[model samples]
Target: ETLLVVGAGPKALAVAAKSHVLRQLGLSAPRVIAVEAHAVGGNWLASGGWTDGRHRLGTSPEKDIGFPYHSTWARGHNREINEAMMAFSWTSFLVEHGTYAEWIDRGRPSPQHHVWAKYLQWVARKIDLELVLGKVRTIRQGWSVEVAGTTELEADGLMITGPGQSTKALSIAEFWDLAVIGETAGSALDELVRHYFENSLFSDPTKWNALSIQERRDVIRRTDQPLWFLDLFDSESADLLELAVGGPLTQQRIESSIGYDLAVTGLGAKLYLPNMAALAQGPGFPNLSCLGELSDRVLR
Candidate 1:
């Protein structure tokens, strides 16, 4: 039997791993062939230093679009499970893989995406998944799928995990008419996310740090609120990066006054703290797309 798994990213790796597990459970592991159009790790590497384990998942009731994210199954005993997942994602995963990041000793720790990519590569190796560096041309009949300029793969069951629109254009569109596949089709996921986005732009203040490396390091350690490290952005494109402080405090303060926004809450509170600022596109995956959620369960 053949289980034609589509796409060779994180999701593909997961499906392949599960396939092996199923085999151990007396279920025959089907021939799992994964076709990837690009390099492994998918868009995780092309994130321009945005991919990392630091990407936090599962927020509280007030977070994650208002879901009790810490897991209702564990009650509250598994709180550490959630926190560790977040930390491992945002820090350890990247650091272990050789990503560059500056640690800030403040309320919450933050890391760069550079290390995140390396960690993902580590994950790929850990899962010995069969991968093919190619693209699917068409999936036809009940048991035939063709690759561009390659032999057609015969399969009893197929799981297609390509990008939304791109999947429709595959040469095998005749196998299944996508016209009836409406956005609300249960068989075809038409998930859409609408988000109110916000970001920050920092100014490069490396030139202003005239203090020696040792002195600067000392200042960084001692600096508390009202005197945390500051960064300056110097480009017109960074117009979206500005201090949009709104409150009853009518009159403004000094130009260099590093004020903390307690009103903003959570990670925002420490924005003015003596933290290392990274010129990021906010959270990881600024250019996130439909290619996000293809995985093993989706295949099974």
Candidate 2:
């Protein structure tokens, strides 16, 4: 079976990553051909038009998200529970890209979006999936798509993932019309949607006026789609890595290294590591600038 996966973003890459499993399940010789209008990483890539260097990843590399085989972040800021969601295949295969273990040793700072994107590149390299660079123009009846430069390609299955104006706007209402939502859940789903939008700023005309139409759509899509947001939670309870790593000397070691007391109060057993201060002072606490030169090398 031949599948044409459009775009090389997380979703498209996910389809590619899972192709091997599909083949193993009796789908003989499944081949996935991925095409991206830009480079490998979509919004997460530095070259990806939407991101600036400063934009940090909202999601941690811990949760498997769409593809368990892929790592999302370069560093260890992810909590233990979130990291537990990562598949063995990901940690086992992509350890060369980056590891949570290493990140933890270094104070666990959230990596930038581009850093995560670089890890995506590593996944692409390891998979060795066929990814092409071309802009798709049209789709014909036989699951065929015509790319720019008069290139026509056909596939048994088409996974359209490109973010383009050619894609039609799909509303939750239309989703209901298409029977995507079951009739039994209509009342419950309707009430939930109503409650969410009513309380959400995305539904407010005055507050939403500050955003562009694209931004409004992005926000709504993110809220509705669990895949859009980072799977990690930043609340105190969600951050339980410290409890496992924290010792009686944890605070003292950090203070001695950074030359500033964290003044950590009683916040349960979760050890409060000076992650922020450690980053500014560089990962090697005492050495201060030790990890500065190694920053890019972390995921390179």
Candidate 3:
């Protein structure tokens, strides 16, 4: 019935929209409150904890980025040439409401982070959610939460969608803590990490250079099964893995390289050329063509 949604990012907004529809049907409980620590957009905002100015989203406009069943000129078949999939709703949704046509008129090629944040605020306005701009410091068994600078509030159910140890967005540190230190000595994920540290050719540039393409494929595939859980760590850990195998980069590359590992070879099949470019920048890496153009693309 009653819903207490945490955070005000895209996920929270999606939940808010759902609750709005449910309440309109007069079936769901009338009460809904969303408590956000920062202003509306969570990590998508420039000032949000994990975001930086250089960060750009990586998916196509029509794919997972746009809300389901929404229509827009933003949709496209190819990943590279399409508009960046940064909108929680279709760009046409914003176009339908006003604010998006001018962005297109300005000849914007892709969605930038700041504009994405504004779009999220527009979504919040549309949802008409009861918002509390404060951090939730305490939660108890009775479905009550206490936000700082505010009294305790009650709800029928609580949906926490923030990124942290308590939420589903696990960090590599958390995974290492749980899998390696907390679990038995030879746990599967622990062995995965260990094997990656020990046997990966990419872990050493010299070894990486000596390997042929097939050999590189063999090594990556060898570790694939055990390292599947690595997908669960935060996106930043992808950069960490990049750093481990290779050298460092500018803060722009590090921040912009949100899905270096996933874009290369993951359970998900959509590949971005920028990821390969980022990986190739280290010592003894394959001298792949298009490195210059792809590097520029990622920074956008």
Candidate 4:
């Protein structure tokens, strides 16, 4: 069966390398093909649109394409397979380029973008991976991927990666954005609260539809105190909120400031955040915490 990966970036290259690693060890592996309109290493390379080639990789070098080297899974837990995989790793790329010794002596900094890109492309070549250089025109008919100037590509499985064109959530400074407007950054709070307050009241229009303008404003102030608090509180200051002190009398006994919020009442239970999922279970993959883990999850 064929598995088509959408981009030829580090993640896509890792998939190709891992699939090759599996095949070379005489395990059953699907045919992996990567298509990129840009360079084989994607945006990090000089050929791609985004990278300047001199920028330092924001990601760590230890978590290379062959990262999390020891695993519970077959391909990695097996030492010989890991040894084979390590030959394609980032440090191995430096070794091949005759700088691995100096890299160690210099205290092991993160690689430049182009060097990392070169390592990706090197793995691509060593695996003899097919990297079709073309733009994918569209996706239609389930697994069929339409390429710009070739016969329509179809696969038993497909993977899509890269950026999206729209915003799905409110920005971090959303309340501030609403508050800032025409002059001196506009209404400090009251008007910003009206927008959300009226929307919540929209559910009961019988009570809202004919209310006087002043009455509507009064009802908003009486009902939605949280929105006013949201307007006053900066979302960017979680640490600041956690660190702030209360009155001198309250401060005398308490050591932490989570006490201030629940000083009048009590505290509570488990809270999950957007970033908390990774902290709990998943590998860090919003970018590249573990590329080997990222590849094995899909390439298998």
Off by over 4 Å in 1: 24-27, 47-120, 164-300
lDDT of 3 by residue, 1-300 (tens): 555655765545555554454345443333657888777866565455344423444333322222332222222332422222232355755565685677578764455555566666776776676799887766553256677856777765555454442123343333333333221123334336654532322223323435465554444343321222234334554455455335454424432343432133321222222223323322211111112122222212
Residue 29 lDDT in model 2?
A: 39
What does candidate 1's lDDT look like per residue over 132-247, in tens digits?
77666654443355665476776554544423322233212222232433211321232112102111101122232343545433433322111111111123211212334232
User: 1-300, model 4: which lDDT tens digit per residue?
Assistant: 677766776667766787888887877666888878766776665444343455577657767777765554444336766788898887888888999999899888888778888887888888988877777765543256667646678766555444321111232124333333321122223344676545333221223335565665454343310011112223332223233433331312222231211121111211111111121123142245555655655544
lDDT of 2 by residue, 120-177 (tens): 5665775676887787665443256667745878765554443342112343323333
Best by TM-score: 4
Off by over 4 Å in 2: 24-29, 65-94, 165-300
lDDT of each: 0.34, 0.41, 0.44, 0.53
Give all TM-scores, in the order shown. Answer: 0.37, 0.46, 0.45, 0.59
- Clash pairs detected, candidate 2: 59-230
Worst 10 residues of 4 by lDDT: 270-279
Q: List where candidate 4 sits over 4 angstroms from the true fold.
A: 73-77, 164-283
Candidate ranking (lDDT, best to worst): 4, 3, 2, 1
Candidate 2's TM-score reads 0.46
Cα displacement (angstroms), candidate 1, residue 155, comes to: 2.1
